Design a protein around this ligand. Structure first.
Ligand SMILES: [Pr+3]
Ligand SMILES: [Pr+3]
Ligand SMILES: [Pr+3]
Ligand SMILES: [Pr+3]
Ligand SMILES: [Pr+3]
Ligand SMILES: [Pr+3]
Ligand SMILES: [Pr+3]
Ligand SMILES: [Pr+3]
Ligand SMILES: [Pr+3]
Lengths: 196, 196, 196, 196
């Protein structure tokens, strides 16, 4: 068995680094199944040359809406669950990570099917916050996915490989996705059908 | 569809800024209906020239009270729910936002009707905390709403408009409200009546 | 009605201050009734000359124990609830505050009566953490209450008075308590008796 | 009764210190019973010469996995519960502490028995984060336990002793464990058997 983190605390990735290069999110988001749950997933990169600490991820849905009483809220914000309640949103960023939002009854995507997706006027805003270990100061890295950048029925190509003791990252596959068989039904639609 | 946040992470608001001007809360708070729930809402402004990070909102009710056992607590503090349990209190402050507190069984306003409002000896304290991106240091901006500054049955005038690619903010409508048809019953009173 | 916090955000306390003096906890803790619940309460002071921010309170019980399997844990730590789950532990420290821990089924004090109190080998550790606004750096102020410093059946003397527009603090009554009629039964004992 | 923390807030440990030495985790993790619950425990050390503040502990499970749909996640991360939901993960680090993760239905170890342990391809990553009081800047200390470093049926040797007023720490027993009678059944297996 090959360790990922040594006793003293130094990680075994990118042999021989120094632990202003910006942080990367995948260009695209995907939606596909994971242990019978529908998920929306994007990948968030690591800082090659340094650690990021009190590191955490969140996501906002920018979508205009009208309240039943008539009130039009242009570009309304509502939080997307990506680990808040369990702490999985507090990241150990030592290699590019797939962040996953389980689309459930409380998810803004509960009712959206594949065909219904590209009709939606919406935008996901991904926000990474953390303190850069060397530097000392707090960072914040943002990116955005509009509808036409969310791919239904795809998965992320694994970037991780282990050769000669260390773990190395194929960075040319970072934004790479691939197609996987996936229902076109909405999350709600899938639970309705299951519950009978 | 016109993006609000670009891939690289720069927002498309106030074309051509530099991303000591203080932050603004609306002068007034309002109470009115939103998807069948009664809400107390105030607006909190953005920092024209910079980002605010680990950005978060909370609110305190200053109200003296007497415990059933006889104990008089002058100017007692109790938290007002404005997103704590879901993370909606963690703000993405890229344009003036309406903060909303759903008046429910746990809300200090559960039992207060329109007529009953102006009799109450109470004060809401709104507190924004965040680290200013450029600067590096933590900010804290406070403001206050007493009874006579909470308007029953109003809504906030939308400040947001999109012209020529960017989103621009009509700041002269920031504190602007308008009247909307709203029940004068208290939140509790409204749920009692509904549940039959 | 006399405001405690003005629109611009400056508080109306201690007329004419500058908003190394250390922070004070009350020397003593008390236990007494509040709206039919038994509570353990201590008072935590304010920083005369400055604000404290991301301000928060927690409390630890230092008490040795033996696990049913035989394991002796000298000076074991277990968290005391003083607002965690609702945010009431996030403080707006603009005047000396009574912190309150509702003694319930999950409280380490559930089973302790008045007579049973002074037999207990225990210690409460109160810890205030916050960033000092002027300074910029994080503070931490600790204090401790052993058994013989927790007074059963007392309350805190209110320090707060309003004269000539501003609110002024009688600091000679900070640590002052007074006796109030209170059951000598334990919290559990009180709920058992009530539930019949 | 001998205090651990004095009124003014100075702790009574290591008589006569100054309150770059790194922080230590125990080399080994253990699994054994605590009040009828199965627990995974590691010990985390203190900073001899200084306080650590906003101090907190978390733990990550690095374990590759395959989703029922076929997706292989190399070196997948999932949070281990070590106090998140109650605040017991927010540490008062004034002497070496045993961190405890109660192995329950939500714990990744629910299904793992003694014999089944050494077959598992897994790694626990322990991460302490805190601000160093003197310094001002944020620390982060990591360590790791692979399978062969988790000892089933052991406990930690207590390091704490009180002599001449102060509490002193036998640091040569920090990583010391000892055997204790413990079931070889998995956590799930133990609950199945109990529930009949
Ligand atoms: Pr290679
Ligand atoms: Pr490829
Ligand atoms: Pr214009
Ligand atoms: Pr207008
Ligand atoms: Pr922080
Ligand atoms: Pr006077
Ligand atoms: Pr007096
Ligand atoms: Pr000695
Ligand atoms: Pr020994």
């Amino acid at each position: 068995i090959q360790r990922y983190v040594r006793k003293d605390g130094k990680c075994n990735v990118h042999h021989g680094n120094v632990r202003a290069e910006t942080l990367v999110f995948s260009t695209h988001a995907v939606i596909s199944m994971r242990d019978g749950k529908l998920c929306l997933m994007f990948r968030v990169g690591d800082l090659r040359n340094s650690h990021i600490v009190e590191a955490s991820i969140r996501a906002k849905l920018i979508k205009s809406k009208q309240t039943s009483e008539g009130e039009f809220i242009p570009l309304n914000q509502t939080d997307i669950n990506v680990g808040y309640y369990t702490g999985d949103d507090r990241l150990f960023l030592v290699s590019p990570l797939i962040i996953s939002h389980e689309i459930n009854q409380q998810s803004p995507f509960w009712e959206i099917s594949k065909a219904q997706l590209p009709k939606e006027e919406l935008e996901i805003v991904v926000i990474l916050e953390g303190m850069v270990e060397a530097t000392g100061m707090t960072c914040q890295a943002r990116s955005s996915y509009i509808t036409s950048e969310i791919l239904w029925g795809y998965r992320f190509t694994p970037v991780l490989t282990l050769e000669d003791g260390f773990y190395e990252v194929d960075y040319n596959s970072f934004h790479e996705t691939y197609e996987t068989s996936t229902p076109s039904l909405s999350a709600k639609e899938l639970a309705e059908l299951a519950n009978r």
